[PDB]
Amino acid sequence: MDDISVIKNEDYEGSHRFLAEELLMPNANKTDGNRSTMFCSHLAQAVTLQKAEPPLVYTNFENQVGKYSTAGYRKANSNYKVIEKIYKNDYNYVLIVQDQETGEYTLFERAECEFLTEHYGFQWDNDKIDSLKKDDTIEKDTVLYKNTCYDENMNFGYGVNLNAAYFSYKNETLEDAIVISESAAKKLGTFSVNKVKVSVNTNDILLNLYGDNENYKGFPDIGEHIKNQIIASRRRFDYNTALYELKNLNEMRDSDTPFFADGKIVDIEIFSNVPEEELKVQKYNEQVLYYINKQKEFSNNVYQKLKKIVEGKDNNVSDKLLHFYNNCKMRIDENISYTYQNSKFSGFIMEFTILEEEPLNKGSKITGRYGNKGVISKILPDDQMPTVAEGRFKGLKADICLNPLGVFNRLNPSQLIEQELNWIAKFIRKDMEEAGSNEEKVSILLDFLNRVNKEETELMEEFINSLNKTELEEFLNDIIENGIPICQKPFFGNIGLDELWELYNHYDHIDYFKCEGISTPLIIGEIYMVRLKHEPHSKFSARSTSKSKNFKEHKDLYSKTPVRIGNMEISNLSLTNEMGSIMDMLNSYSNNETNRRELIMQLLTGNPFDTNIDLSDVESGTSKILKSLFTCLGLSIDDV
Amino acid sequence: MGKKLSLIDFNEIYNEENLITRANPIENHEFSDDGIYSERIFGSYNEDDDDKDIDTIGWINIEPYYIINPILFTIIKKCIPSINKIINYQGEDDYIGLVKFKDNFDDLLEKYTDKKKYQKEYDFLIENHDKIFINKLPVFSHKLRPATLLTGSKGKVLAFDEINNYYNFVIEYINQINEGVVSDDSIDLLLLPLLYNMQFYANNILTRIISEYLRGKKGFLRKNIMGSRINFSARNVITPLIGHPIDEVAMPYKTFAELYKFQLINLISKVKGINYNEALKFWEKGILGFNQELYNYMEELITKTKGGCTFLLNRNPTISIGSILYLKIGLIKKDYKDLTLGISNNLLSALSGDYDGDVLNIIPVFDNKMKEHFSLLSPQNFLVDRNNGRFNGDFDLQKDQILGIFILNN
């Protein structure tokens, strides 16, 4: 509506009720709406980080976001007791438990990775569930497995804190470009999990890519990483009766279908529609047989253990346990014909689950909570980055360097406030470390926090007075070395121009850092940084003459989708006023098959370092078909 | 459908050698040499031995009888709405029949027409009177119309498009008519309906070829005008490059390998004395991961090739001068993960693109002659603004660059 007089600030004062995703953004009143909406987009585009940290400057709603976003953690919902543990793989296993109140029998599943979509996934901290053994009670709110986002006390982190300085690094930090320390890039690490299906029919066999002559292994094992980005390759045969192609195991050909991924496979699920005796005779199936047997061994194992509970009259089983039991029973049961896409399939279909630690690489996009964007232009050694010299903070190196030009134009001032607060906090930490008793340290801490956030100061006084002297010393050391928590609420409770002004006036010793080779003094302060989903790999295309969807089906390493030339492109090329060469490129590259063959042949038969191509003048195949059909139509072109 | 274009006199171009007067689809368990699928006149799978192209066109003979030209049928239908009724055999003359229609056509055209409505069509009929009736109807090559073999319960059966059915039906009808000498003595009056069905089938053949143009002949050709799919093409994200000339760029390991694959295979075959297939195996191994040996072959190509290794970089929409640029591959990246093209900041303003994740198309140019002609699109030539003749600020110093010179001088 036009009327905004209805909005009265006194009504919404002290409440963040009007904020949603921006509850994760400090000093949101100071950031523009455009930057805020970009931040909201980035949070969904954010990728999981192995070494995620709770933000140094926090809004205090982050833990709630971790709590109510259930995809990252598994919490027991009742008191349980561990009946038994069954293993399918070293990495994948199931735990059967009984409700201590209902008596219902339920199960919990353990796996290394969680697959979300495409390549996106994350590894699990499975410490607690792995600790559990038979006849061990699971308390009501225990967390069996957690994501890397959550910590020991279930604090939530979507990014890492990196020391940042606004500096013009050899023009590498141009526009939204960033230079990162190699150690810092190690901190910003993601996982990639892929579920890849290879379908081998009766006439297809898998080449011995991972095996010797004595032992035939055509695909990686559960504990082995993929080599050369090839899981397996299938050769289709016209008739598998001869079995003469035993000698062909090592070689590869273009006709063979190759399946591409990199990482450690962690689970194999095989769906077989072939009788066991038919499979056993051939040695080339040996590896497959093992996993098939293993699956059956797992399934049978659950069936024997749970048959009394499920098929007993009481049937105090959860629906999950019932369906798991039924599926395993179907697997062991004969006359089980597996159908994929509503059709019965020959041979077997294998699903590999592959987990890879994907590191930060050039072209990756990283951001802060304030809508800024950055692309990693260069990763440089720690020594090459700005390092302050001849101070109490001597040898401190900046993890990331950001563009100073245009910072105010972005209309997201809050990133600077985060930097200033962590930088001033460094001085407070050194002041605590340098001198005093524990009481002096808490006094300095409480004064600084009183300057920043009164609520944090009050709660910290309570928390500190609660602590024992040993615990107090440990907490103080944690603050000195790891960092200091500072609370900057989104709208109500953040500091401003006047408060930072007072902070700078009181702390006269705090002044810019003098770096080693830099004339201009610099400020180095920690900023919270997040890793975005975009990487160059998504849009890479490269094509050489002989969508296909093979790449989506993992049959091609990279997309070979052709680029399109149109009338606009032809006009811009026609600027040269040499139309014949443009037509030659079009015919040699696309339209004319004869000229295309000539180009390929000449490129491979001519001198490597001197290439001159002569193309024959011939009507294209499309033109020939057009003339033939038109003459049948009864109309003929007169070169009008 | 309706187009104004030159007509062809079929009789002059008709060739008796490629005449399909045999209607049998198969003869004695073999493809008929006189059949529609004839290896002798149309060609076969071994097309290189045949030396006969898709352009090979068969013929069918209706002599001694004439049919209405299928392309010209619609204009006659507008002139004579009763054409469909009149041709069938079952004013002064009504529904006489096709053969009778030919004799009285000139009078009939004047008899049943509105001059104001169809004068242009009537004038066209006067102009192309000789082409109204056709003695021979063409049939296009069997290679275009495939007949796939399938196994059948009674016996193996050949699946083929309806166009083949239309052709074989037409030949089947005509073949019996010419044979009969003493049957025809008085049968000639009911022989006329047989010719009528032939005319309708030929019309559907004409309509099907019109649909054939829609089914990836004219649709594919006009789609090519919409977008010609060029091989030796690439798409890549752009990242800033420092320390190298403006025209020179840095290309990822994967990007160079595919585009210059055949050039790369040539060197490996020459250096290691191996077969082209074996050299491909070396290239396939290199694609998987960074190996110094394939990098060495790639480095030698960029270093030693005449004119350098050059390409065209376009940012779409290609609406401005400098949208497509002729550039040189200065360096090949040694990081397999790095998949970003390295470009000078000065080029960006001409392209009008941004380092925001936008992708630019890479089309390499190989021929030294083509390299020279496209060198007119190089950044160096575009230093001069074409409207003014002055230096172009698009290639001038940018934000970070200006500040350093300013601190130096001011």
Beta-carbon separation of A557 and B70 below 8 A: no
Phi/psi at B348 (5° precision): -60, -40
Count of beta carbons in the 10 Å neighbourhood of residue A189:
19
Encoded tokens for B68: 């209405």
Kind and range of the H or E run holding B292: helix B292-304
* DSSP-derived secondary structure for A590-610: II-HHHHHHHHHHHHHS-SS-
Helix (H, G, I), strand (E, B) or coil at B357: coil
Q: Which of A228, A551, A633 to mutate to test the interface with B (most CBs of B within 10 A)?
A: A633
Strands (DSSP E) contained in A398-462 are 400-402
Torsion of CA A357, A362, A368, A371, to 10 degrees: -120
Burial class (CB in 10 A: 0-12, 13-18, 19+), B316: middle
Contacts of B237 in chain A (CB under 8 A): 363, 536, 539-540
Q: Where on the phi/psi map is residue A103: left (φ > 0), alpha (ψ -120 to 50), or beta?
A: left
Which residue of chain B is at minimal alpha-carbon distance from A542?
B234
**Token match 């390409």: residue?**
B311
Number of CB atoms found within 10 A of residue A401's CB: 26
Report residue A49 as tokens: 């980080």
Question: What does DSSP assign to residue A210?
Answer: S
d(C-alpha A373, C-alpha A39), whole Å = 9
How far is CA B168 from each of CA A51, A573, B139, B178, rounded to the nearest angstrom?
74, 49, 10, 16
List the single residue in A362, A576, A636 with the smallest CB-CB distance to B340: A362
Could B324 and A562 be called an inter-chain contact, meaning their C-beta atoms sit closer than 8 Å?
A: no
- At A623, the amino acid letter reads S
Dihedral angle of Cα B298, B304, B306, B312, to the nearest 10 degrees: 30
On the CB side of A564, how many CA atoms lie within 13 Å of its CA?
10
d(CA A332, CA A297): 9
Q: By the 8 A CB rule, do B4 and B28 touch?
A: no
First to last CA, chain A: 62
Distance separating alpha carbons of residues A163 and A395, to the nearest angstrom: 13
Nearest-10 Cα torsion for B205, B206, B208, B210: 170
User: What contacts A599, CB < 8 A, 6 or more positions away?
Assistant: A545, A588, A589, A613, A615, B366
- Angstroms from B93 CA to nearest CA on chain A: 30
* Separation between Cα atoms, residue A540 and residue B42, nearest integer Å: 44
The strand pairing partners of A527, in sequence order, are: A162
The alpha-helical segments, DSSP class H, found in A15-105 are 33-45, 62-68
Position of tokens 């190989």? B366
DSSP string, A235-258: EE-S-SSS-GGGGGGS---SSSEE
Q: Distance between CA atoms of A294 and A74, rounded to whole angstroms? A: 27
- The CA distance from A304 to A307, in Å, is 6
Tokens of A476: 């103080």
Residue A537 in tokens:
């790999």
**Quick check: B232 and A589 CB within 8 A?**
yes
Q: Are residues A405 and B403, on separate chains, in Cβ contact within 8 Å?
A: yes
How many other C-beta atoms can be found within 10 angstroms of the C-beta atom of residue B361?
23
C-alpha distance from B185 to closest chain A C-alpha (Å): 34
Contact state of A609 with B305 under an 8 Å Cβ cutoff: yes
Plot region of B263 (φ>0 → left; ψ -120 to 50 → alpha; else → beta) = alpha
* Distance (Å, whole) CA A317 – CA B37: 69
| Closest chain A residue to B268, measured at CA | A608
Is B398 part of the contact surface with chain A (CB cutoff 8 Å)?
yes
The minimal CB distance from A562 to the residues B6, B230, B374 is found for: B230
Provide the token pair at A184: 């810092």
- Paired strand residues for A236: A204
Residues 6+ apart with CB under 8 A from B155: none
Residue A402, beta-bridge partner list: A166
Closest to A352 measured CA to CA, from A92, A101, A562, A41:
A92
CA nearest A228 in B: which residue?
B288
CA angle B182, B183, B185 (to 5 degrees): 65
Euclidean distance between CA atoms B11 and B136, whole angstroms: 7
SS3 B383: helix
Residue in B239, B281, B315 to test binding to A, most A beta-carbons within 10 Å: B239
Alpha carbon A194 to chain centroid, angstroms: 11
Which residues neighbour A500 within 8 Å (Cβ) at sequence distance 6 or greater? A417, A420
Given A172, A557, A576, which is nearest B287 (Cβ)?
A: A557
Which residues have a Cβ under 8 Å from the Cβ of A469 and sit 6 or more positions away?
A: A438
Say if residues A629 and B387 touch (Cβ distance below 8 Å). no
CB atoms near residue A443 (< 10 Å): 13
- A355 to chain B, minimum CA–CA distance in Å? 17
Can you tell me the distance from the alpha carbon of A221 to that of A373, in angstroms, rounded to the nearest whole number?
A: 40
Beta bridge partners of B164: none
* 3-state SS class at B217: coil
Chain A partners within 8 Å of B141 (Cβ): 628
Cα–Cα–Cα angle for A629, A632, A633, rounded to 5 degrees: 85
C-alpha span between B60 and B175 (Å, rounded): 10
Q: Mention every residue, 6+ apart, whose C-beta is less than 8 A from residue B168.
A: B23, B25, B36
Kindly report the nearest CA distance between residue B13 and chain A, in angstroms: 10
Q: How many residues does chain B have?
A: 410
| H or E, element range at A377 | strand A373-380
Resolved by: X-ray
In 3D space, the residue among A11, A556, A522 whose CA is nearest the CA of residue A229 turns out to be A556
Are A577 and A584 contacting, i.e. CB atoms less than 8 angstroms apart?
Answer: no
Nearest to A94 by CA among A121, A154, A142, A134: A134
Using an 8 Å CB-CB cutoff, list chain B residues near A545. 231-232
Q: How far apart are CA B268 and CA B264, in angstroms?
A: 6
Alpha-carbon dihedral angle through residues B232, B238, B240, B242, given to the nearest 10 degrees: -10
Task: Out of A589, A603, A627, name the one closest to residue B55 (CB).
Answer: A627
Could you please report the per-residue DSSP string of B156-187? -EEEE-HHHHHHHHHHHHHHHHHH-SSSHHHH
Chain A nearest C-alpha distance from B238 (Å): 8
Neighboring chain B residues of A561 at a CB cutoff of 8 Å: 235
- For B24, B147, B160, the CA distances from B154, given in Å and listed in that order, are 20, 19, 18
Is the minimum CB–CB distance between B129 and chain A shorter than 8 Å? no
B137 DSSP β-pair partners? B60
Separation CA A185–CA A51 (nearest Å): 11
Residue contact B144–A567, C-beta within 8 A: no
Q: Name the residue facing B400 among A174, A585, A611 (closest C-beta).
A: A174
Q: What angle do CA A489, A493, A497 make, to 5 degrees?
A: 105
Contact A447, A507 (CB under 8 A): no
- From residue A468, alpha-carbon distances to A149, A456, A493, B349 in Å are 29, 20, 30, 63
Task: Decide: B231 and A562 in contact? Cβ < 8 Å.
Answer: yes
- Contact call for residues B259 and A542 (beta carbons, < 8 A): yes
Nearest by CB to residue B224, choosing from A170, A173, A591, is A591
Identify all chain A residues contacting B70, using CB atoms and an 8 Å cutoff: 633-634
Q: Are A535 and A363 in contact (CB under 8 A)?
A: yes
Q: Do A622 and B404 touch (CB under 8 A)?
A: no
Whether B314 and A572 lie within 8 Å, measured CB to CB = yes
Give the experimental resolution in Å. Answer: 3.3
Q: Are strands A190-200 and A348-358 parallel, antiparallel or unpaired?
A: antiparallel
Minimum Cα–Cα distance from A635: chain B residue: B7
Query: Is B54 in contact with A621 (Cβ distance < 8 A)?
Result: yes
Contact check, Cβ <8 Å, B263/A608: yes
